[PDB]
Amino acid sequence: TEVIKNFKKGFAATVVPDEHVEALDEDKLAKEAVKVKKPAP
Amino acid sequence: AATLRELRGRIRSAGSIKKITKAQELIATSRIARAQARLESARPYAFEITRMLTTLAAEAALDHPLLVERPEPKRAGVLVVSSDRGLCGAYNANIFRRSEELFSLLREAGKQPVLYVVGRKAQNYYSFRNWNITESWMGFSEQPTYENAAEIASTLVDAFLLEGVDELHIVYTEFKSMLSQSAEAHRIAPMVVEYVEEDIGPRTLYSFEPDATMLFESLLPRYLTTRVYAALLESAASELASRQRAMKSATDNADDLIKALTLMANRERQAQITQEISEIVGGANALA
Amino acid sequence: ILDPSVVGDEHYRVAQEVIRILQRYKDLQDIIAILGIDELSEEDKQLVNRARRIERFLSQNMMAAEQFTGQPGSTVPVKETIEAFDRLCKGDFDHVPEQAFFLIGGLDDLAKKAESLGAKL
Amino acid sequence: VFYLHSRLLERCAKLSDDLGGGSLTGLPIIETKANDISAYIPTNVISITD
């Protein structure tokens, strides 16, 4: 047990993937708006 | 031998599965009715708060943090709305596809996605990919209350006003026409000031107590919360519709599997009888 | 002769990983047959997608098949096969659709069919 | 066939100290078909060995 623990002392075991997905079309990302009635386009 | 035994075992297994999936489909139908009821029940408050927000924005200072976009956008907090239970179809998978499209849109503009999840399925999907989930909410996907939406919206708006995000998005399944469960990405913050028209000409002046800007800034986070709640309800109804469709599909599949397994079992039964007769007659002819 | 002492360590390792992925895919055929790939774990969904791509990539346009499809046959060197299936097992083509692995030769044909379908290696 | 395999395999034994104490260890090999461990010869031999 002593040997095993002294060995585990020095033992060395072996980020997000890309998913290669293409960007959403900005025209399909809806935007919550405040429908004001003032004339100022 | 022992092949007919395993075939009959698989047959009774598939029969149990078929019964369970049929029951689950009918239960999902009843609960779809319930969820549509809750959605059309929450509709009126949404309409009225939208109208009041419009009346307030008509005569307010439109420079609220939730209303102006920020130069140097570095981070967008995305809230992914998935389910807790899993007997739905591609519901969660469609949500995750839409969320990945949104993440790859946000990395194109230099923003860093900050991820909030609703549901255990999104928790699994994002922990498997070594994501960093700032906050998670679970247990109210099939019947969300306004208090859950209030908590979520408060956390999101606190992150927005502040370790800080410059945009706020929601990826959830929109429910329409009882036939369209479509994963969609919405931008809830910052809102965009859109001018429709004077509409009515000269009309009566609206009184504001104490003034329009105070009420506007008091209503803006309330409107965020109302929209989060509507998104939660739509996603719940969509999850129930997806579960009904998926359980009907699984019932048809278990039916076809029972049919094929029964054909194989009858073949093995006939073959066993023929082989036994061959052995008996072989012995009898050897002795004759 | 599918043995490290005859074909090599890399050949043998790639073959064993392909066989492990295909066996795990076969063990799930009842769940996938009744419920689909949507109920599996994330590990198992990833494995099932890799296994579908591996089982389509084991097909090939043969020289003897031109009398049936009009499409000419292809030859793939064993080093190219080892490299390609290593990259499939590691997951380098998880984004490429299931088709574009079907009835092709080496990695060049995979690239060409993937971009004719709309993807990129 | 059972008598065949059983009288073949029963001759693998650990002898007593008076008989020398020798041993014959047996490793019979049986190939099943389609994992059918419950065929005739497989079940004959499974019931003979230790």
UniProtKB/Swiss-Prot annotation, chain B:
<keyword id="KW-0375">Hydrogen ion transport</keyword>
<dbReference type="GO" id="GO:0015986">
    <property type="term" value="P:proton motive force-driven ATP synthesis"/>
</dbReference>
<protein>
    <recommendedName>
        <fullName>ATP synthase gamma chain</fullName>
    </recommendedName>
</protein>
<dbReference type="InterPro" id="IPR023632">
    <property type="entry name" value="ATP_synth_F1_gsu_CS"/>
</dbReference>
<keyword id="KW-0066">ATP synthesis</keyword>
<dbReference type="InterPro" id="IPR000131">
    <property type="entry name" value="ATP_synth_F1_gsu"/>
</dbReference>
<comment type="similarity">
    <text>Belongs to the ATPase gamma chain family.</text>
</comment>
<keyword id="KW-1003">Cell membrane</keyword>
<dbReference type="GO" id="GO:0042777">
    <property type="term" value="P:proton motive force-driven plasma membrane ATP synthesis"/>
</dbReference>
<keyword id="KW-0813">Transport</keyword>
<dbReference type="InterPro" id="IPR035968">
    <property type="entry name" value="ATP_synth_F1_ATPase_gsu"/>
</dbReference>
<dbReference type="GO" id="GO:0005524">
    <property type="term" value="F:ATP binding"/>
</dbReference>
<comment type="subunit">
    <text>F-type ATPases have 2 components, CF(1) - the catalytic core - and CF(0) - the membrane proton channel. CF(1) has five subunits: alpha(3), beta(3), gamma(1), delta(1), epsilon(1). CF(0) has three main subunits: a, b and c.</text>
</comment>
<keyword id="KW-0472">Membrane</keyword>
<dbReference type="GO" id="GO:0046933">
    <property type="term" value="F:proton-transporting ATP synthase activity, rotational mechanism"/>
</dbReference>
Curated annotation (Swiss-Prot), chain C:
<comment type="subunit">
    <text>F-type ATPases have 2 components, CF(1) - the catalytic core - and CF(0) - the membrane proton channel. CF(1) has five subunits: alpha(3), beta(3), gamma(1), delta(1), epsilon(1). CF(0) has three main subunits: a(1), b(2) and c(9-12). The alpha and beta chains form an alternating ring which encloses part of the gamma chain. CF(1) is attached to CF(0) by a central stalk formed by the gamma and epsilon chains, while a peripheral stalk is formed by the delta and b chains.</text>
</comment>
<comment type="function">
    <text>Produces ATP from ADP in the presence of a proton gradient across the membrane. The catalytic sites are hosted primarily by the beta subunits.</text>
</comment>
<protein>
    <recommendedName>
        <fullName>ATP synthase subunit beta</fullName>
    </recommendedName>
</protein>
<comment type="similarity">
    <text>Belongs to the ATPase alpha/beta chains family.</text>
</comment>
Curated annotation (Swiss-Prot), chain D:
<comment type="subunit">
    <text>F-type ATPases have 2 components, CF(1) - the catalytic core - and CF(0) - the membrane proton channel. CF(1) has five subunits: alpha(3), beta(3), gamma(1), delta(1), epsilon(1). CF(0) has three main subunits: a(1), b(2) and c(9-12). The alpha and beta chains form an alternating ring which encloses part of the gamma chain. CF(1) is attached to CF(0) by a central stalk formed by the gamma and epsilon chains, while a peripheral stalk is formed by the delta and b chains.</text>
</comment>
<protein>
    <recommendedName>
        <fullName>ATP synthase subunit alpha</fullName>
    </recommendedName>
</protein>
<comment type="function">
    <text>Produces ATP from ADP in the presence of a proton gradient across the membrane. The alpha chain is a regulatory subunit.</text>
</comment>
<comment type="similarity">
    <text>Belongs to the ATPase alpha/beta chains family.</text>
</comment>
